[PDB]
Design an enzyme around this catalytic site. Structure first.
Site, PDB file in Angstrom:
ATOM      1  CG  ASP A  16      -0.157  -0.173   2.457  1.00  0.00           C
ATOM      2  OD1 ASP A  16       0.986   0.239   2.609  1.00  0.00           O
ATOM      3  OD2 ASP A  16      -0.842  -0.851   3.321  1.00  0.00           O
ATOM      4  CD1 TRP A  46     -11.374 -25.718  -3.970  1.00  0.00           C
ATOM      5  CD2 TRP A  46     -11.446 -27.803  -3.130  1.00  0.00           C
ATOM      6  NE1 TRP A  46     -10.701 -25.702  -2.771  1.00  0.00           N
ATOM      7  CE2 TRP A  46     -10.733 -26.976  -2.234  1.00  0.00           C
ATOM      8  CE3 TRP A  46     -11.626 -29.156  -2.790  1.00  0.00           C
ATOM      9  CZ2 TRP A  46     -10.225 -27.468  -1.056  1.00  0.00           C
ATOM     10  CZ3 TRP A  46     -11.094 -29.629  -1.620  1.00  0.00           C
ATOM     11  CH2 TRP A  46     -10.411 -28.785  -0.763  1.00  0.00           C
ATOM     12  CB  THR A  58     -12.208 -25.944   2.851  1.00  0.00           C
ATOM     13  OG1 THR A  58     -11.065 -25.254   2.349  1.00  0.00           O
ATOM     14  CG2 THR A  58     -12.074 -27.395   2.428  1.00  0.00           C
ATOM     15  N   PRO A  59     -14.848 -23.341   2.560  1.00  0.00           N
ATOM     16  CG  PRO A  59     -17.242 -23.066   2.581  1.00  0.00           C
ATOM     17  CD  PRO A  59     -16.106 -24.000   2.152  1.00  0.00           C
ATOM     18  CB  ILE A  60     -12.861 -18.975   5.849  1.00  0.00           C
ATOM     19  CG1 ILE A  60     -12.236 -18.713   7.205  1.00  0.00           C
ATOM     20  CG2 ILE A  60     -13.322 -17.679   5.150  1.00  0.00           C
ATOM     21  CD1 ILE A  60     -11.011 -17.780   7.052  1.00  0.00           C
ATOM     22  CE  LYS A  89     -23.107 -31.388   9.988  1.00  0.00           C
ATOM     23  NZ  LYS A  89     -24.365 -30.750   9.570  1.00  0.00           N
TER      24      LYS A  89
END
Ligand SMILES: CC(C)(COP(=O)(O)OP(=O)(O)OC[C@H]1O[C@@H](n2cnc3c(N)ncnc32)[C@H](O)[C@@H]1OP(=O)(O)O)[C@@H](O)C(=O)NCCC(=O)NCCSCc1ccc(O)cc1
Ligand SMILES: CC(C)(COP(=O)(O)OP(=O)(O)OC[C@H]1O[C@@H](n2cnc3c(N)ncnc32)[C@H](O)[C@@H]1OP(=O)(O)O)[C@@H](O)C(=O)NCCC(=O)NCCSCc1ccc(O)cc1
Ligand SMILES: CC(C)(COP(=O)(O)OP(=O)(O)OC[C@H]1O[C@@H](n2cnc3c(N)ncnc32)[C@H](O)[C@@H]1OP(=O)(O)O)[C@@H](O)C(=O)NCCC(=O)NCCSCc1ccc(O)cc1
Ligand SMILES: CC(C)(COP(=O)(O)OP(=O)(O)OC[C@H]1O[C@@H](n2cnc3c(N)ncnc32)[C@H](O)[C@@H]1OP(=O)(O)O)[C@@H](O)C(=O)NCCC(=O)NCCSCc1ccc(O)cc1
Lengths: 140, 140, 140, 140
Positions: A16, A46, A58-60, A89
């Site tokens: 930045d 996937w 594998t979503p957070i 899960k």
């Protein structure tokens, strides 16, 4: 536990105006390190798991991170990822990010514990599934 | 505390193959919401604070986030940011992200508590400073 | 031709160490402006066109861009998009990006002509299709 | 001319809902390949050139790109960059991006000619400079 390591070179565009890595870039790398871990442990991509078993990835679901020191373009990051705990899960994936001083010292840049789940897309609705036994054994 | 709200439209490119917002995009928005809060509360832009007082911005030192439901392109996010607690050289900025069902229901998408500090660049070294009194009063 | 306008606020994270907008951010905005144009002209979102007609979106095949002046965080961009020419299976979308001096002067920041096509995913293979007549009439 | 090659692995997050690399990601890689070329040819990093000679980097002024085939997560890109032509205050950097089928075939993904300049920041104003002779010789 079973740990995988990956390197990541910081680019000028990853920084930045303040001259350092812009944070959300760390999350991109952690996400790559997350999947890399699985790949490296043998799971199919996937693209394939979604065909075979509906697994889209594998979503957070949760994250705790701490940013210890700054990093900038040209620094080369070394990321360490392991699964810290299997749950029903969900699973806790831990990452340690560091860089190496020219003194050969390994400075910790950042660390983060990601809670993720194996998920399926039930049409427009995302759904978590029981960690697949096969998966646990592979990553073990 | 003193809360600021901002909207953010999700674009197709902000989504992953799984069809939902790719997480590190949330951190981009939270970072914009973080600065927006300050702006909206009256501080000058970093560009100026760096000239006047060496303040290059408010780097993040820690974060706890939770991802409650998914979001996708075209959904419009509403972000709520406030400072939850002032500390010595740090401060906890809290963000709540939600979207609105067409039922007019306000679903929580994500939430996150960011621990940041006001910092200066002492040459190549980033350094945190005591929260500026003026700043506390402005944001108050 | 039929022109749509959209605004885009530049964020601190959209800038590089050089203090200005990092270029690939312009392409994100142009991509949003591209789809916005279609939306605003009445087409359904890809999510839906893919169900109804296999149309997954409008991938880019070619681009010519020129960066006229710099832009930075806090500047607010105004993007102008129109379809400059319909071809058989492609179309030229033109964008003009500008910002406004406080003198009320409208400085041109960048411009770009994007050649895109309506496409379908034939399994793993992306395929362009004849511009849909309905689409031409809508955008007209 | 003098050509440098670099590899880039595509990540899941670099892809869009359509399952392929989202275009502005190519520009991130081309920008990294651009600087890598210079680095690899011996110039110091901007961080240093800005101190020593005011050179903040090589901003882009123009670009022509063509996207030949799609790419997705896990594909590994090979980028070829060279300077195609030196001009007075600008230079044309050419990049060829390809991927390798498992047949060992080298498919062209994308190509792009970037017109950039060496620049300085004269306060808030960005200014191009005459290509430095030293630079031409190094990259030669
Ligand atoms: C993931 C999903 C659908 C799960 O909800 P659910 O299907 O009703 O099931 P659930 O509530 O039991 O949660 C599954 C497990 O995760 C655990 N979990 C869920 N939320 C949390 C949390 N905040 N903290 C800790 N654990 C959690 C749950 O307790 C549960 O646990 P268990 O082991 O005790 O059974 C829901 O949390 C959700 O949609 N969260 C939003 C996910 C999201 O959008 N994250 C941002 C994008 S991530 C992009 C990405 C996608 C694929 C990739 O490969 C990589 C990145
Ligand atoms: C920020 C800095 C230099 C501070 O270290 P320091 O100068 O030695 O001072 P310090 O240790 O006392 O920390 C200052 C305060 O923050 C608190 N703090 C620091 N780390 C943590 C942590 N992990 N959890 C909670 N609070 C923390 C400290 O306790 C301290 O507290 P106090 O109120 O009790 O006095 C050091 O933590 C650091 O470099 N962290 C890396 C920062 C970074 O790179 N984050 C990623 C990029 S953020 C990009 C960005 C930049 C500007 C913007 O406007 C927005 C985004
Ligand atoms: C798009 C596709 C599959 C078309 O190839 P094709 O199916 O064999 O058909 P085609 O060769 O006739 O091309 C279709 C039309 O585009 C025109 N076209 C194709 N390439 C070019 C080019 N370089 N310059 C000008 N026009 C072109 C063709 O001449 C043709 O024209 P026509 O009107 O005379 O019939 C092939 O060019 C390709 O895969 N290019 C790569 C696309 C890509 O990956 N771009 C980067 C990602 S864009 C992400 C995105 C996705 C969806 C969105 O909503 C937004 C962004
Ligand atoms: C770059 C700058 C200040 C140069 O304007 P100037 O100082 O008045 O000088 P100038 O007009 O003579 O242009 C210098 C040379 O570039 C050539 N040039 C400039 N525009 C073009 C164009 N559209 N097409 C071809 N050549 C061009 C000029 O003809 C000139 O040529 P010469 O060899 O015949 O002497 C002005 O074009 C500008 O600000 N463009 C905007 C740049 C920008 O914001 N690009 C987006 C961000 S790039 C981020 C980045 C930064 C550093 C990096 O290391 C990497 C990425």
């Amino acid at each position: 536990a079973r740990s995988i390591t990956m390197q990541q070179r910081i680019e000028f565009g990853d920084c930045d105006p303040a001259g350092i890595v812009w944070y959300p870039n760390y999350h991109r790398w952690l996400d790559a390190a997350s999947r890399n871990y699985f790949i490296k442990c043998g799971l199919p991509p996937w693209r394939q798991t979604v065909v075979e078993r509906g697994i889209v990835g594998t979503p957070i679901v949760s994250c705790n991170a701490s940013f210890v020191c700054t990093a900038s373009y040209d620094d080369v990051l070394t990321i360490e990822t392991c699964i810290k705990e299997w749950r029903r899960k969900s699973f806790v994936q831990r990452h340690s990010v560091s860089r190496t001083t020219p003194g050969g010292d390994v400075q910790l840049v950042m660390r983060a514990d990601e809670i993720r789940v194996f998920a399926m897309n039930d049409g427009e609705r995302l759904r978590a599934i029981e960690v697949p036994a096969d998966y646990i054994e592979l990553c073990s």
